[PDB]
Amino acid sequence: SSFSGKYQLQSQENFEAFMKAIGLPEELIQKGKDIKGVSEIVQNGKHFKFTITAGSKVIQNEFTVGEECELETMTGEKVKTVVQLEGDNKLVTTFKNIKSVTELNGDIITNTMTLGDIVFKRISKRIGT
Ligand SMILES: CCCCCCCCCCCCCCCC(=O)O
Numbered sequence: 001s002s003f004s005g006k007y008q009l010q011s012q013e014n015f016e017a018f019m020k021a022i023g024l025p026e027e028l029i030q031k032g033k034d035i036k037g038v039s040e041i042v043q044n045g046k047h048f049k050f051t052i053t054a055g056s057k058v059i060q061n062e063f064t065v066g067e068e069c070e071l072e073t074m075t076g077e078k079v080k081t082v083v084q085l086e087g088d089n090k091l092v093t094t095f096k097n098i099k100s101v102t103e104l105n106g107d108i109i110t111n112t113m114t115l116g117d118i119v120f121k122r123i124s125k126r127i128g129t
């Protein structure tokens with residue numbers, strides 16, 4: 001249950017640059033850049049379910065650690081990949097040349113996505129139960 005909970009974005013870096021590079025429609029970039037998105041994670045052993053809500057955009061994903069999964073990304077593109085744990089508190093995957101690291105430290109989840117020189121970093125904080 002390490003990751004389980006509800007978290008909301010506190011701050012992020014390089015949203016616009018990153019989203020434009022990956023092919024997000026620009027009117028979604030514009031509507032989305034200042035939204036404080038909410039992430040709901042449910043972990044049960046190796047099985048994870050996560051929902052990410054950013055203003056009427058709702059992305060629901062599931063995966064088993066160390067198994068092939070199909071992740072729906074920012075644009076709607078579904079990608080086959082493997083998510084690994086690197087310790088109890090860290091989720092790592094790569095897709096479309098993007099390295100995604102999700103790290104929980106107490107109540108703060110730091111998500112770092114790097115595509116080439118672009119490092120997109122999001123900091124979220126637990127919000128209740
Ligand atoms: C309908 C207007 C809202 C605009 C849609 C917002 C789309 C922006 C997507 C940002 C989500 C960040 C990617 C998830 C990172 C992660 O949790 O792994």
Ligand SMILES: CCCCCCCCCCCCCCCC(=O)O
Pocket residue numbers: 037038039041050052059071072073074083091093100102109110111122123124
């Ligand atoms: C929509 C982008 C796909 C995300 C791929 C990463 C899969 C493992 C991480 C799942 C937990 C995500 C936690 C959300 C953190 C955040 O909203 O910034």
Ligand SMILES: [Ba+2]
Pocket residue numbers: 002088089
């Ligand atoms: Ba823990």
Ligand SMILES: [Ba+2]
Pocket residue numbers: 080081082093094095
């Ligand atoms: Ba991969």
